[PDB]
């Protein structure tokens with residue numbers, strides 16, 4: 001037998017290889033920054049500085065032969081390709097006529113976007129998040145936002161993953177018309193332009209590559225040489241920790257829906273669908289696709305867009321086409337992929353789509369049963385109520401009555417049940433509907449007692465403007481506040497109200513509020529009681545389960561109540 005091969009670690013790139021190349025120190029176009037390979041190029045060097053080198057080598061991964069070639073001289077380079085990610089015990093064998101000798105086993109790392117090379121993620125979850133034995137068949141979803149790692153300081157390892165079936169990752173942009181992005185500020189439009197350089201219109205990209213895959217997280221063991229970092233590497237590790245968990249990219253959202261309006265042309269859908277397939281092959285930790293178009297027929301961020309004739313049919317066609325594409329992926333991989341959508345529940349949004357048609361291709365509809373009322377005007381109301389509140393006029397709930405000016409209502413009032421019933425009325429099965437819970441409040445100021453028509457219902461008052469405050473109190477935008485902020489600064493330990501605020505609950509609507517009489521500050525949100533009511537409602541109707549926006553804003557109370565309501 002010849003001399004046993006000795007691995008040259010430096011000449012073998014410390015045995016670290018990757019199926020994906022990701023730019024870490026620059027920012028450029030998506031296709032410039034991200035290069036995915038179906039086969040990793042492996043290059044291992046070994047030495048035989050004494051005795052006979054032999055004639056032939058064999059490379060083994062966990063005892064399975066993966067390469068073979070010739071040995072010449074004391075130095076040998078073994079170049080081959082390998083397509084499965086993970087950690088393998090590598091042995092290199094040298095053979096001649098007299099026999100074979102093997103190197104000592106050493107670990108080789110081949111990175112892939114399924115996280116197979118990564119150890120399961122260690123968590124840092126707020127202990128206020130409780131442990132539950134909820135039926136795994138019940139949907140328990142939430143949104144994790146890409147930008148939450150900044151001011152909100154909320155990272156993947158903070159998620160109460162044991163209390164979730166679905167993580168929706170917001171948001172994936174589509175290259176093309178995106179004027180609505182400018183309303184965000186923070187240089188987000190320019191960031192999108194950069195990402196889209198070298199990318200065709202209607203193809204998906206990553207908006208924030210720093211957050212997505214570049215940022216080094218010490219809790220995930222990231223270092224300079226780590227081939228995948230950021231939120232994505234952490235989500236990959238999360239898949240290893242919780243194998244039954246579904247992680248789904250959310251495409252669009254309020255600010256990134258503009259390109260959807262061009263899906264009336266099938267050519268644009270074709271381009272999009274193909275890009276999504278590429279995206280799911282590149283990022284293997286993702287378990288499907290979620291479409292967040294706000295909204296078919298219009299009424300979204302872009303006032304100049306919306307086609308009530310063609311948008312709904314395009315939406316249905318998109319779902320059909322996405323399902324065909326996902327079926328291709330299922331055939332190629334043996335995996336199961338999910339197709340979902342978050343949708344508006346206002347009567348004027350629901351009416352623009354035949355969801356009975358669309359839903360045949362879909363696993364779930366995430367019914368966005370919030371944002372019913374808010375700081376966009378000075379009219380108080382329950383933003384996420386199950387039913388019509390006491391503040392509503394007779395006939396307002398169903399929409400058959402008349403407003404202040406004598407003008408008839410144009411449709412049923414904005415409530416969760418009104419939305420759900422409209423979807424059911426179309427023929428959508430209840431077991432595909434997921435009910436939305438809010439982990440945030442919307443709010444006003446100047447709703448002082450004198451503005452109220454009913455003195456002990458602040459929802460009958462009138463605002464002077466939006467709720468204002470600091471990010472310390474969870475106010476990231478005027479008129480919007482994190483639930484955990486409401487709890488910390490308005491509710492207090494026993495939900496009795498602090499800092500001039502009082503707690504109230506509309507039993508008719510199933511909706512809480514906090515009201516400061518002196519400042520006129522009023523906040524509408526979901527709390528333990530209303531979320532219990534939502535869970536009991538979801539069970540009674542046989543809905544698929546519950547979902548929420550956004551997990552960073554919860555302190556545990558809301559997700560806790562979601563589980564307790566579905567018990």
Ligand SMILES: CC(=O)N[C@@H]1[C@@H](O)[C@H](O[C@@H]2O[C@H](CO)[C@@H](O[C@@H]3O[C@H](CO)[C@@H](O[C@@H]4O[C@H](CO)[C@@H](O)[C@H](O)[C@H]4NC(C)=O)[C@H](O)[C@H]3NC(C)=O)[C@H](O)[C@H]2NC(C)=O)[C@@H](CO)O[C@H]1O
Pocket residue numbers: 147184186188252253254255256299300344345346349370371372374376414476477480549
């Ligand atoms: C029932 C019904 O039809 N109601 C309508 C309301 O939906 C509508 O109010 C609008 O509601 C959407 C959904 O909640 C909301 O969209 C959110 O917008 C914020 C910014 O305002 C986004 O958060 C930002 O995201 C960017 C990236 O895009 C981040 O960089 C930025 O840091 C984030 N800013 C903050 C403060 O966190 C959210 O991502 C986005 N949510 C979703 C789900 O996409 C709009 O803001 C609401 N519009 C207004 C004007 O308030 C209402 C008004 O149009 O009309 C009702 O009829």
